Amino acid sequence: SEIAHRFNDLGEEHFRGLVLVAFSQYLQQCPFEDHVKLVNEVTEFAKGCVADQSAANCEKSLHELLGDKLCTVASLREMADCCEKKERNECFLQHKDDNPGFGQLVTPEADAMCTAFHENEQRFLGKYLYEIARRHPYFYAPELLYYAEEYKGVFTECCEAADKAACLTPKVDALREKVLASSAKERLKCASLQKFGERAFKAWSVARLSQKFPKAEFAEISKLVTDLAKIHKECCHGDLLECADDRADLAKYICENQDSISTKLKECCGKPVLEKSHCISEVERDELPADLPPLAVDFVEDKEVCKNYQEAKDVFLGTFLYEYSRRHPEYSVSLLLRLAKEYEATLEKCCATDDPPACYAHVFDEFKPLVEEPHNLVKTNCELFEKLGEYGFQNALLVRYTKKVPQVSTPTLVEVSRSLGKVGSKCCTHPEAERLSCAEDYLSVVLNRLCVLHEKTPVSERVTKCCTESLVNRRPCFSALQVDETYVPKEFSAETFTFHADLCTLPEAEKQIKKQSALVELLKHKPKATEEQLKTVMGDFGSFVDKCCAAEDKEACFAEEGPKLVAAAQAA
């Protein structure tokens, strides 16, 4: 039996959690109580499979069981369309929503939250899991469990502290930020596996793993990246139980082979399964051995370049990226992979041209301008970030990227531009030796979110091209783009600017979000004449909103001065 095996390996509680996040990812709009009952029934049946491995349905697969369980009340609807199939799993996964119309989480006060957490922390943590996974349907299944344990620790500490609210707000913000980072990074792995292939994913994971553990053998990281590609294959295909079990088994194998990998794993393996898997998942980069010679001896000056590459090209290039990455933790993964593709094409064209050795002796000349452009842009953009701050950074980036692609929906423009602005708060704070890595990897993640949001409703052709071609050339692609002229400017309409009075009661974050959305409409309506007039109008917005909010009128000054500043703004 399958369910009996998973239940033996994963335990009852973790089982309940993984089933709950499964149903919360497949059914995002469904209320919580239904998920409670369904998880209860699933565990109820799994215990029976553990008692008798030959029971009626215990020989069935997981997808058949879960689909059968979902189509009892899920036929109430476009989720009854997949229930007319048996293909059904791929239908369900296709009907996942990357951007669901779910609010950005409502939070009660401190004492009510502590009352709910004390009252029953099972339903409390389960509610947290449901609310997190229902907005992020492509979250790493075990990592969500560990983050749930961190949530448990947060409430356990703050409900016994001096002031529960002051203790609880910044911690909730912290775990929120880390959780959104984990979900943002995981969305790129499922985008590489489902759309770019285990070849591309294996290249990426080989680059990062070689950067993290330079002391390991190439065969070790080859088998390891194979296994990792397997477990992420299962997590991206909705196979959450076998993904969690396989992750636990991988952590076990790594802890049984400490000498063969690194020296930074001594204190990670002395933790519970999820603390172990998180600890390993972000352990600091290891030191480099001493028995390493020059790369040019084996990969440029060597005489076996064409014959060895012709014997096994994927293993050859994998060894190339392995040797290049383990000596450069200061490069981004995308940079290393771009260099690997340039080397691949070089070996593809030189071994057939006039003289192989002579012309592939000039690879470094090709490698010079590829490393320059990233560091140039992290220099320039960290300069701008330090000059303007995070808010002005997001604003200037909104100018740049609205002029880049004016066909994009405004919530996606602002949503991607603010996360773009967070790269200065995240990476420019680090020393310059860890700037390009953090920076470019983060940028490829953000642009990945942009491409998976543009995939739902394509609108611009250039976005389509820069999202379809190469996964690694994604960040450079967007940098090569500039102002678009196929777009015809939008006319100021009776909807683009007349907002409402409740804006005075909303917090500063959403107020700045509205400021930037109106700024996006401003940029779209007239992209050319956009000198200091953008700032001149953007300041008048704040002047009007503040002077009218600070009047305590019963929604009069807003409707009055609303129809004025649309024409006063069109005149500028």
Coordinates of C-alpha atoms in Angstrom, one line a residue:
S1 CA 0.0 0.0 0.0
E2 CA 1.1 3.5 -0.8
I3 CA -0.7 5.5 1.9
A4 CA 0.5 3.0 4.5
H5 CA 4.1 3.6 3.4
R6 CA 3.8 7.4 3.4
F7 CA 2.0 7.2 6.8
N8 CA 4.8 5.0 8.2
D9 CA 7.5 7.4 6.9
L10 CA 5.9 10.8 7.7
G11 CA 3.9 10.3 10.9
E12 CA 0.3 11.2 11.6
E13 CA 0.6 14.9 12.3
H14 CA 2.9 15.8 9.4
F15 CA 0.6 13.7 7.3
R16 CA -2.4 15.8 8.3
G17 CA -0.5 19.0 7.5
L18 CA 0.7 17.8 4.1
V19 CA -2.8 16.6 3.1
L20 CA -4.1 20.0 4.3
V21 CA -1.7 22.0 2.2
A22 CA -2.5 19.7 -0.7
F23 CA -6.2 20.5 -0.5
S24 CA -5.5 24.2 0.2
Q25 CA -3.3 24.4 -3.0
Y26 CA -5.8 22.5 -5.2
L27 CA -8.9 24.3 -3.7
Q28 CA -8.0 28.0 -3.0
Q29 CA -11.5 29.5 -3.0
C30 CA -13.0 26.7 -0.8
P31 CA -13.8 27.5 2.8
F32 CA -11.7 26.1 5.6
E33 CA -14.2 23.7 7.3
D34 CA -14.5 21.6 4.2
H35 CA -10.7 21.1 4.1
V36 CA -10.9 20.2 7.8
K37 CA -13.4 17.4 7.2
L38 CA -11.6 16.1 4.1
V39 CA -8.3 15.9 5.9
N40 CA -10.0 14.1 8.8
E41 CA -11.4 11.5 6.4
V42 CA -8.1 11.0 4.6
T43 CA -6.2 10.4 7.9
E44 CA -9.1 8.2 9.0
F45 CA -8.6 6.0 5.9
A46 CA -4.8 6.0 6.1
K47 CA -4.9 4.6 9.6
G48 CA -7.0 1.7 8.2
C49 CA -4.4 1.2 5.5
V50 CA -1.7 1.0 8.2
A51 CA -3.7 -1.6 10.1
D52 CA -4.4 -3.7 7.0
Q53 CA -2.1 -3.2 4.0
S54 CA -4.5 -5.3 1.9
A55 CA -7.6 -3.3 2.6
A56 CA -9.9 -2.4 -0.3
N57 CA -8.6 0.9 -1.6
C58 CA -5.1 0.8 -0.1
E59 CA -3.7 -0.7 -3.4
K60 CA -4.9 2.4 -5.3
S61 CA -2.6 5.3 -6.2
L62 CA -2.6 8.7 -4.4
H63 CA -3.9 10.8 -7.2
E64 CA -6.9 8.5 -7.8
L65 CA -7.8 8.6 -4.1
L66 CA -7.4 12.4 -3.7
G67 CA -9.4 13.1 -6.9
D68 CA -12.2 10.7 -5.9
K69 CA -12.3 12.5 -2.5
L70 CA -12.4 16.0 -4.1
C71 CA -15.1 15.3 -6.7
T72 CA -17.7 14.6 -3.9
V73 CA -18.4 18.3 -3.0
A74 CA -16.0 19.8 -5.7
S75 CA -18.5 19.0 -8.4
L76 CA -20.4 22.0 -7.0
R77 CA -19.0 24.8 -9.2
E78 CA -14.9 25.2 -13.6
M79 CA -13.8 22.5 -11.2
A80 CA -16.6 20.1 -12.2
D81 CA -14.9 19.9 -15.7
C82 CA -11.9 18.0 -14.4
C83 CA -14.3 15.7 -12.5
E84 CA -15.6 14.4 -15.9
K85 CA -12.1 12.8 -16.4
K86 CA -10.0 10.1 -14.8
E87 CA -5.6 13.5 -17.2
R88 CA -7.6 14.6 -14.1
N89 CA -4.4 15.4 -12.1
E90 CA -3.0 17.6 -14.9
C91 CA -6.4 19.3 -15.2
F92 CA -6.4 20.1 -11.5
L93 CA -2.8 21.4 -11.6
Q94 CA -3.7 23.4 -14.7
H95 CA -6.6 25.0 -12.8
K96 CA -4.3 26.4 -10.1
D97 CA -4.4 30.2 -9.7
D98 CA -1.0 32.0 -9.5
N99 CA -2.8 35.3 -8.6
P100 CA -6.0 34.5 -6.8
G101 CA -8.4 37.3 -5.8
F102 CA -7.7 36.6 -2.1
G103 CA -7.2 39.6 0.2
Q104 CA -3.8 40.3 1.7
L105 CA -4.6 38.6 5.1
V106 CA -6.7 40.2 7.9
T107 CA -5.2 40.1 11.4
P108 CA -7.1 40.5 14.7
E109 CA -5.6 42.2 17.8
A110 CA -2.9 40.7 20.0
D111 CA -5.1 39.3 22.9
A112 CA -7.6 37.8 20.6
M113 CA -4.9 36.1 18.6
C114 CA -3.3 34.7 21.7
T115 CA -6.7 33.6 22.9
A116 CA -7.1 31.7 19.6
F117 CA -3.6 30.2 19.7
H118 CA -4.0 29.0 23.3
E119 CA -7.6 27.8 22.8
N120 CA -6.6 25.2 20.2
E121 CA -3.2 25.6 18.4
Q122 CA -4.0 22.7 16.1
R123 CA -6.9 24.5 14.4
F124 CA -4.8 27.7 14.7
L125 CA -1.7 26.4 12.9
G126 CA -3.9 24.6 10.4
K127 CA -5.7 27.9 9.7
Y128 CA -2.3 29.5 9.2
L129 CA -1.3 26.8 6.7
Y130 CA -4.6 27.1 4.8
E131 CA -4.3 30.9 4.5
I132 CA -0.7 30.7 3.4
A133 CA -1.0 28.0 0.8
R134 CA -4.3 29.2 -0.6
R135 CA -2.5 32.3 -1.9
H136 CA 0.7 30.5 -2.9
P137 CA -0.3 27.3 -4.6
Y138 CA 3.3 26.5 -5.6
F139 CA 4.9 26.5 -2.1
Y140 CA 7.5 23.9 -1.1
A141 CA 5.4 21.5 0.9
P142 CA 7.9 20.7 3.8
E143 CA 9.3 24.2 4.0
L144 CA 5.7 25.4 4.7
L145 CA 5.7 22.9 7.6
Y146 CA 8.9 24.3 9.1
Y147 CA 7.7 27.9 8.6
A148 CA 4.5 26.8 10.5
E149 CA 6.7 25.7 13.4
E150 CA 8.4 29.1 13.3
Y151 CA 4.9 30.6 13.5
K152 CA 4.2 28.4 16.5
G153 CA 7.4 29.6 18.2
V154 CA 6.4 33.2 17.5
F155 CA 3.1 33.0 19.2
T156 CA 4.5 30.8 22.0
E157 CA 7.1 33.5 22.8
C158 CA 4.9 36.6 22.4
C159 CA 1.8 35.3 24.2
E160 CA 4.1 35.1 27.4
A161 CA 5.8 38.4 26.9
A162 CA 5.3 41.9 28.4
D163 CA 3.3 43.5 25.6
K164 CA 1.8 41.0 23.2
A165 CA 1.0 43.4 20.4
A166 CA 4.4 45.2 20.3
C167 CA 6.1 41.7 20.5
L168 CA 3.9 40.3 17.8
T169 CA 3.7 42.8 15.0
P170 CA 7.3 42.9 13.8
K171 CA 7.7 39.1 14.1
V172 CA 4.6 38.5 12.0
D173 CA 6.1 40.9 9.5
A174 CA 9.4 39.0 9.6
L175 CA 7.9 35.5 9.0
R176 CA 5.7 37.0 6.4
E177 CA 8.7 38.4 4.5
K178 CA 10.7 35.1 4.8
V179 CA 7.6 33.1 3.7
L180 CA 7.0 35.3 0.7
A181 CA 10.7 34.9 -0.2
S182 CA 10.5 31.1 0.0
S183 CA 7.4 31.0 -2.2
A184 CA 8.9 33.5 -4.7
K185 CA 12.0 31.3 -5.1
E186 CA 10.1 28.1 -5.3
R187 CA 7.9 29.4 -8.1
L188 CA 11.0 29.7 -10.3
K189 CA 11.9 26.0 -9.7
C190 CA 8.5 24.8 -10.8
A191 CA 8.8 27.2 -13.8
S192 CA 12.1 25.6 -14.8
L193 CA 10.9 22.1 -14.3
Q194 CA 7.5 22.3 -16.0
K195 CA 8.5 24.7 -18.8
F196 CA 12.3 24.4 -19.2
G197 CA 13.1 20.8 -18.4
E198 CA 15.1 18.8 -15.9
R199 CA 18.1 19.6 -18.1
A200 CA 17.9 23.3 -17.4
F201 CA 16.9 22.7 -13.7
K202 CA 19.8 20.3 -13.3
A203 CA 22.2 23.0 -14.7
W204 CA 20.8 25.6 -12.2
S205 CA 21.1 23.3 -9.2
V206 CA 24.6 22.1 -10.3
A207 CA 25.7 25.8 -10.4
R208 CA 24.3 26.7 -7.0
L209 CA 25.3 23.4 -5.3
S210 CA 28.9 23.8 -6.7
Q211 CA 28.9 27.3 -5.3
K212 CA 27.8 26.1 -1.9
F213 CA 29.9 22.9 -1.5
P214 CA 33.2 23.2 -3.4
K215 CA 34.9 20.4 -1.6
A216 CA 32.5 17.7 -3.0
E217 CA 33.1 15.4 -5.9
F218 CA 31.5 16.1 -9.2
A219 CA 29.8 12.6 -9.1
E220 CA 28.5 13.4 -5.7
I221 CA 26.8 16.7 -6.8
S222 CA 25.7 14.9 -10.0
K223 CA 23.7 12.2 -8.1
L224 CA 22.6 14.8 -5.6
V225 CA 21.3 17.2 -8.3
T226 CA 19.5 14.3 -9.9
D227 CA 17.8 13.5 -6.6
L228 CA 16.9 17.1 -6.0
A229 CA 15.4 17.4 -9.5
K230 CA 13.4 14.4 -8.6
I231 CA 11.9 15.7 -5.3
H232 CA 11.2 19.1 -6.9
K233 CA 9.6 17.3 -9.9
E234 CA 7.3 15.6 -7.4
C235 CA 6.5 18.8 -5.5
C236 CA 5.8 20.7 -8.7
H237 CA 3.5 17.9 -10.1
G238 CA 1.3 17.9 -7.0
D239 CA 3.0 14.8 -5.5
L240 CA 3.5 16.3 -2.1
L241 CA 3.7 13.2 0.1
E242 CA 6.4 11.5 -1.9
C243 CA 8.2 14.9 -2.2
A244 CA 8.3 15.4 1.6
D245 CA 9.3 11.8 2.1
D246 CA 12.0 12.1 -0.6
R247 CA 13.3 15.3 1.0
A248 CA 13.6 13.6 4.4
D249 CA 15.4 10.7 2.8
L250 CA 17.8 13.2 1.0
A251 CA 18.6 14.9 4.3
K252 CA 19.2 11.5 5.8
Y253 CA 21.7 10.5 3.1
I254 CA 23.4 13.9 3.3
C255 CA 23.8 13.5 7.1
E256 CA 25.2 10.0 6.5
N257 CA 27.9 11.4 4.1
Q258 CA 29.3 14.5 5.8
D259 CA 32.9 14.0 4.9
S260 CA 32.0 13.5 1.2
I261 CA 30.2 16.9 0.9
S262 CA 31.3 19.7 3.2
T263 CA 32.3 20.7 6.7
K264 CA 29.4 23.1 7.6
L265 CA 26.9 20.3 8.3
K266 CA 28.0 19.2 11.8
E267 CA 25.4 21.3 13.7
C268 CA 22.6 21.1 11.1
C269 CA 22.1 17.3 11.3
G270 CA 21.5 17.5 15.1
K271 CA 18.1 18.9 14.6
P272 CA 14.6 17.6 13.9
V273 CA 13.7 16.6 10.3
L274 CA 12.3 19.9 9.2
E275 CA 14.9 22.0 11.1
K276 CA 17.5 19.8 9.5
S277 CA 16.1 20.3 6.0
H278 CA 15.9 24.0 6.4
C279 CA 19.3 24.2 8.0
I280 CA 20.8 22.3 5.1
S281 CA 18.7 24.2 2.6
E282 CA 20.5 27.5 3.6
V283 CA 23.9 26.6 5.1
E284 CA 26.7 29.1 4.4
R285 CA 29.1 28.5 1.6
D286 CA 32.0 26.2 2.4
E287 CA 35.7 26.9 2.0
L288 CA 37.7 25.9 -1.1
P289 CA 40.3 23.2 -1.2
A290 CA 43.9 23.8 -2.2
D291 CA 44.6 21.1 -4.9
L292 CA 43.0 23.1 -7.7
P293 CA 45.0 24.2 -10.8
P294 CA 44.0 26.6 -13.6
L295 CA 40.8 26.2 -15.6
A296 CA 42.6 27.1 -18.9
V297 CA 44.8 24.0 -18.5
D298 CA 41.9 21.6 -18.8
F299 CA 39.3 23.6 -20.7
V300 CA 41.2 25.9 -23.1
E301 CA 44.8 24.7 -23.6
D302 CA 44.0 21.0 -23.4
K303 CA 44.2 18.9 -26.5
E304 CA 41.2 16.7 -25.7
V305 CA 38.7 19.5 -26.1
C306 CA 36.9 18.3 -29.2
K307 CA 37.2 14.5 -28.8
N308 CA 36.1 14.5 -25.1
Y309 CA 33.3 16.9 -25.8
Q310 CA 32.2 14.7 -28.7
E311 CA 32.3 11.6 -26.4
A312 CA 29.9 12.9 -23.8
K313 CA 28.9 16.6 -24.2
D314 CA 26.4 16.9 -21.3
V315 CA 28.8 15.4 -18.8
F316 CA 31.7 17.5 -20.2
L317 CA 29.8 20.8 -19.9
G318 CA 28.5 19.8 -16.5
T319 CA 32.1 19.3 -15.4
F320 CA 32.9 22.7 -16.9
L321 CA 30.1 24.5 -14.9
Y322 CA 31.1 22.5 -11.8
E323 CA 34.7 23.6 -12.0
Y324 CA 33.8 27.2 -12.8
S325 CA 31.2 27.5 -10.0
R326 CA 33.1 26.0 -7.2
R327 CA 35.8 28.7 -7.6
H328 CA 33.4 31.7 -8.0
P329 CA 30.8 32.2 -5.2
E330 CA 30.9 35.9 -6.2
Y331 CA 29.1 35.3 -9.5
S332 CA 25.4 34.9 -9.8
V333 CA 24.1 31.5 -10.9
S334 CA 22.7 33.1 -14.1
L335 CA 26.1 34.5 -15.0
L336 CA 27.8 31.1 -14.6
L337 CA 25.1 29.5 -16.8
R338 CA 25.4 32.2 -19.5
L339 CA 29.2 31.5 -19.5
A340 CA 28.4 27.8 -19.8
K341 CA 26.2 28.3 -22.8
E342 CA 28.8 30.6 -24.5
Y343 CA 31.4 27.8 -23.9
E344 CA 28.9 25.3 -25.4
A345 CA 28.4 27.2 -28.6
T346 CA 32.2 27.9 -28.8
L347 CA 32.9 24.1 -28.7
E348 CA 30.0 23.7 -31.2
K349 CA 31.5 26.0 -33.8
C350 CA 35.2 25.7 -33.3
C351 CA 35.6 22.0 -33.7
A352 CA 34.2 22.2 -37.2
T353 CA 36.0 25.4 -38.3
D354 CA 39.5 25.8 -39.7
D355 CA 41.6 24.9 -36.6
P356 CA 39.9 23.8 -33.4
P357 CA 42.7 24.6 -30.8
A358 CA 43.6 27.9 -32.4
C359 CA 40.1 29.4 -32.3
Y360 CA 38.9 27.9 -29.0
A361 CA 42.0 29.2 -27.4
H362 CA 40.2 32.6 -27.4
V363 CA 37.3 31.8 -25.1
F364 CA 38.3 34.4 -22.5
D365 CA 37.9 37.2 -25.0
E366 CA 34.2 36.1 -25.2
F367 CA 34.1 35.8 -21.4
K368 CA 35.1 39.4 -20.8
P369 CA 32.0 41.4 -21.7
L370 CA 29.6 38.9 -20.1
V371 CA 30.9 39.5 -16.6
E372 CA 31.1 43.3 -17.0
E373 CA 27.4 44.1 -17.8
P374 CA 26.0 42.5 -14.5
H375 CA 28.5 44.3 -12.2
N376 CA 28.0 47.6 -14.1
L377 CA 24.2 47.4 -13.4
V378 CA 24.5 46.4 -9.8
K379 CA 26.9 49.3 -9.3
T380 CA 24.6 51.8 -11.1
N381 CA 21.4 50.5 -9.4
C382 CA 22.9 50.3 -5.9
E383 CA 24.0 53.9 -6.5
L384 CA 20.5 54.9 -7.4
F385 CA 19.1 53.0 -4.4
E386 CA 21.4 54.8 -2.0
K387 CA 20.6 58.1 -3.7
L388 CA 16.8 57.8 -3.6
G389 CA 15.9 55.3 -0.9
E390 CA 13.5 52.4 -1.4
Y391 CA 10.4 54.4 -2.2
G392 CA 12.1 56.6 -4.8
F393 CA 13.8 53.5 -6.1
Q394 CA 10.5 51.8 -6.7
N395 CA 9.2 55.0 -8.4
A396 CA 12.2 55.4 -10.7
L397 CA 12.0 51.7 -11.6
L398 CA 8.3 52.2 -12.3
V399 CA 9.3 54.9 -14.8
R400 CA 11.9 52.7 -16.4
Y401 CA 9.7 49.6 -16.7
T402 CA 6.5 51.4 -17.6
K403 CA 8.4 53.0 -20.4
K404 CA 9.7 49.4 -21.1
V405 CA 6.3 47.7 -21.4
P406 CA 3.3 50.0 -21.4
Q407 CA 0.9 47.2 -22.4
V408 CA 1.1 45.5 -18.9
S409 CA -1.7 45.5 -16.4
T410 CA -1.1 48.1 -13.8
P411 CA -1.3 45.9 -10.6
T412 CA 1.4 43.6 -12.2
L413 CA 3.5 46.6 -13.1
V414 CA 3.4 48.0 -9.5
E415 CA 3.5 44.5 -7.9
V416 CA 6.7 43.6 -9.8
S417 CA 8.2 47.1 -9.4
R418 CA 8.0 47.2 -5.6
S419 CA 9.6 43.7 -5.3
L420 CA 12.2 45.1 -7.7
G421 CA 12.7 48.0 -5.2
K422 CA 13.3 45.5 -2.4
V423 CA 16.5 44.2 -4.0
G424 CA 18.3 47.3 -2.7
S425 CA 17.0 46.7 0.8
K426 CA 18.1 43.0 0.5
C427 CA 21.4 43.0 -1.4
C428 CA 23.0 46.4 -1.6
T429 CA 23.4 46.2 2.2
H430 CA 25.9 43.3 1.8
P431 CA 29.6 43.6 1.0
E432 CA 30.4 43.9 -2.7
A433 CA 31.6 40.3 -2.8
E434 CA 28.0 39.0 -2.3
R435 CA 26.3 41.8 -4.2
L436 CA 26.0 40.3 -7.7
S437 CA 24.9 36.8 -6.5
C438 CA 22.0 38.1 -4.3
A439 CA 21.1 40.8 -6.8
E440 CA 20.9 38.9 -10.1
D441 CA 19.4 35.7 -8.6
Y442 CA 16.8 37.8 -6.8
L443 CA 16.1 39.7 -10.1
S444 CA 15.6 36.5 -12.1
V445 CA 13.2 35.4 -9.4
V446 CA 11.1 38.6 -9.6
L447 CA 11.1 38.5 -13.4
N448 CA 10.0 34.9 -13.1
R449 CA 6.9 36.0 -11.1
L450 CA 6.3 38.7 -13.8
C451 CA 6.5 36.1 -16.5
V452 CA 4.1 33.7 -14.8
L453 CA 1.6 36.5 -14.2
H454 CA 1.9 37.6 -17.9
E455 CA 1.5 34.0 -19.0
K456 CA -2.1 34.1 -17.7
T457 CA -3.2 37.0 -20.0
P458 CA -0.6 37.9 -22.6
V459 CA -0.8 41.6 -23.7
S460 CA 2.6 42.6 -24.9
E461 CA 4.8 40.9 -27.6
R462 CA 8.2 41.9 -26.2
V463 CA 7.3 40.5 -22.7
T464 CA 6.3 37.3 -24.5
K465 CA 9.7 37.1 -26.3
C466 CA 11.8 37.9 -23.2
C467 CA 9.8 35.4 -21.2
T468 CA 9.7 32.5 -23.7
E469 CA 13.3 32.3 -25.0
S470 CA 16.0 31.4 -22.4
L471 CA 15.6 31.1 -18.6
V472 CA 19.1 32.3 -17.9
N473 CA 19.0 35.2 -20.5
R474 CA 15.8 36.5 -18.7
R475 CA 17.4 39.3 -16.7
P476 CA 19.7 40.5 -19.5
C477 CA 16.8 40.4 -22.0
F478 CA 14.8 42.9 -19.9
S479 CA 17.9 45.1 -19.6
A480 CA 18.3 45.2 -23.4
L481 CA 14.7 46.5 -23.9
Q482 CA 13.9 50.2 -23.9
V483 CA 11.0 52.5 -24.7
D484 CA 8.1 51.1 -26.7
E485 CA 6.5 53.0 -29.5
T486 CA 3.9 50.4 -30.8
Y487 CA 1.7 51.5 -27.9
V488 CA -0.7 54.3 -28.5
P489 CA -1.1 56.6 -25.4
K490 CA -4.3 56.1 -23.3
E491 CA -6.9 58.8 -22.9
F492 CA -7.7 60.1 -19.5
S493 CA -10.9 58.3 -18.7
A494 CA -13.7 58.8 -16.2
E495 CA -12.2 56.1 -14.0
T496 CA -8.4 56.5 -14.0
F497 CA -8.1 59.0 -11.1
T498 CA -11.3 59.8 -9.2
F499 CA -10.7 57.8 -6.0
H500 CA -12.6 57.9 -2.8
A501 CA -12.4 59.3 0.7
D502 CA -11.6 56.1 2.6
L503 CA -8.1 56.5 1.3
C504 CA -7.4 58.7 4.4
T505 CA -8.0 55.7 6.7
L506 CA -5.9 53.2 4.8
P507 CA -2.3 52.5 5.9
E508 CA 0.8 54.0 4.4
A509 CA 1.8 50.9 2.4
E510 CA -1.5 50.8 0.4
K511 CA -1.5 54.6 0.2
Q512 CA 1.9 54.5 -1.5
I513 CA 0.6 51.6 -3.7
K514 CA -2.2 53.8 -4.8
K515 CA 0.2 56.7 -5.4
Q516 CA 2.3 54.4 -7.6
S517 CA -0.8 53.0 -9.5
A518 CA -1.9 56.6 -10.3
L519 CA 1.7 57.2 -11.3
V520 CA 1.5 54.3 -13.7
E521 CA -1.7 55.7 -15.3
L522 CA 0.1 59.0 -15.6
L523 CA 3.0 57.3 -17.4
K524 CA 0.8 55.3 -19.7
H525 CA -1.4 58.3 -20.7
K526 CA 1.5 60.3 -22.1
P527 CA 4.9 58.4 -22.2
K528 CA 6.8 61.0 -24.2
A529 CA 6.6 64.4 -22.5
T530 CA 7.8 63.0 -19.1
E531 CA 10.5 65.2 -17.8
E532 CA 10.1 66.7 -14.3
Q533 CA 6.4 67.0 -15.0
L534 CA 5.9 63.5 -13.6
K535 CA 7.3 64.7 -10.3
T536 CA 5.4 68.0 -10.6
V537 CA 2.1 66.1 -10.9
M538 CA 3.0 63.4 -8.4
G539 CA 3.6 66.0 -5.8
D540 CA 0.2 67.7 -6.5
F541 CA -1.4 64.3 -5.9
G542 CA 0.0 64.3 -2.3
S543 CA -0.8 67.9 -1.8
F544 CA -4.5 67.4 -2.8
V545 CA -4.9 64.1 -0.9
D546 CA -3.4 65.5 2.3
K547 CA -5.1 68.9 2.3
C548 CA -8.5 67.3 1.4
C549 CA -8.1 64.4 3.9
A550 CA -7.2 67.0 6.6
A551 CA -10.5 68.7 6.2
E552 CA -12.9 66.2 7.8
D553 CA -15.5 67.0 5.1
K554 CA -18.2 64.4 4.5
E555 CA -16.8 63.2 1.2
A556 CA -17.4 66.6 -0.5
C557 CA -13.9 68.1 -1.2
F558 CA -12.9 64.7 -2.8
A559 CA -15.7 64.7 -5.3
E560 CA -15.3 68.4 -6.0
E561 CA -11.5 68.6 -6.4
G562 CA -11.5 65.2 -8.1
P563 CA -12.9 66.3 -11.4
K564 CA -10.6 69.3 -11.4
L565 CA -7.1 67.7 -11.1
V566 CA -7.8 65.2 -14.0
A567 CA -7.9 68.2 -16.4
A568 CA -5.3 70.1 -14.4
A569 CA -3.1 66.9 -14.7
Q570 CA -3.9 66.5 -18.4
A571 CA -2.8 70.1 -19.0
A572 CA 0.7 69.3 -17.6

